[PDB]
């Protein structure tokens, strides 16, 4: 009808299998392929270009996309997500007006405990992986305090 029906006429000059539609040359494209302006020739979709394709390094492929992970990260079953190889929980330390508030949600516990409470006004927080220590700074005290993750050796 509308189109020249070239799909039926001659594969309709469609890169992918032509799909003769009553209007004419419709053609098609497999997953991960997009029709061009002629809507007959298929292109390659760069899934890596799309944000959130995978948690880590991405490799565009024909109609699909390969992804990698960090040495400390494990690729999930879906192949589009990386998860930490180490089983240790994440200690989401958050400073407070006079204390340090840390959350351990391992095994959906939501362990919210105040690691340090004898503080004037703590602003910055950081940790050392090698020594397993926690560094934080107090504005009013004007000092940089250090302690272990067990809240000791302050
Ligand atoms: C805290 O952890 C460190 C590293 O394991 C250890 O050396 C230190 O003795 C611990 N302190 C307490 C009292 O938990």
Beta-strand (E) ranges in 70-151? 73-75, 82-84, 94-95, 100-104, 111-116, 122-128, 133-138, 143-148
* Experimental technique used to determine this entry: cryo-EM
- How do strand 64-67 and strand 73-75 relate by DSSP bridges? unpaired
User: Residues 127, 93: contact at Cβ < 8 Å?
Assistant: yes
User: Residues 12, 20: contact at Cβ < 8 Å?
Assistant: yes
Ligand 1 test: best mutation among 131, 132, 134, 150, most atoms within 8 Å of CB? 150
Ligand 1 test: best mutation among 113, 127, 152, most atoms within 8 Å of CB? 152
User: Residues 105, 115: contact at Cβ < 8 Å?
Assistant: no
User: Residues 122, 95: contact at Cβ < 8 Å?
Assistant: yes
Residue nearest to atom 6 of ligand 1 (CA): 148
Query: Rounded CA gap, 20 and 24, in Å?
Result: 6
Ligand 1 residue neighbourhood (C-beta within 6 Å): 132, 148, 150, 152
| DSSP summary character for residue 47 | G
Helices (H), the chain: 6-10
Q: Whose CA is closest to 69, among 82, 78, 59?
A: 82
């Amino acid at each position: 009808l509308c189109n020249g029906n070239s799909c039926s006429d001659f594969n309709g000059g469609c890169t992918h299998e032509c799909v003769q539609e009553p209007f004419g040359a419709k053609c098609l494209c497999p997953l991960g392929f997009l029709l061009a302006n002629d809507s007959k020739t298929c292109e390659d979709i760069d899934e890596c270009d799309i944000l959130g394709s995978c948690s880590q390094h991405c490799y565009n492929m024909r109609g699909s996309f390969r992804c990698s992970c960090d040495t400390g990260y494990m690729l999930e079953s879906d192949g589009r997500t990386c998860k930490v190889t180490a089983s240790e929980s994440l200690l989401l330390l958050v400073a407070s007006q006079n204390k340090i508030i840390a959350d351990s949600v391992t095994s959906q516990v939501h362990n919210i405990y105040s690691l340090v409470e004898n503080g004037s006004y703590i602003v910055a927080v950081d940790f050392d992986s090698i020594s397993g220590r926690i560094f934080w700074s107090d504005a009013t005290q004007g000092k940089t305090w250090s302690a272990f993750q067990n809240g000791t050796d302050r």
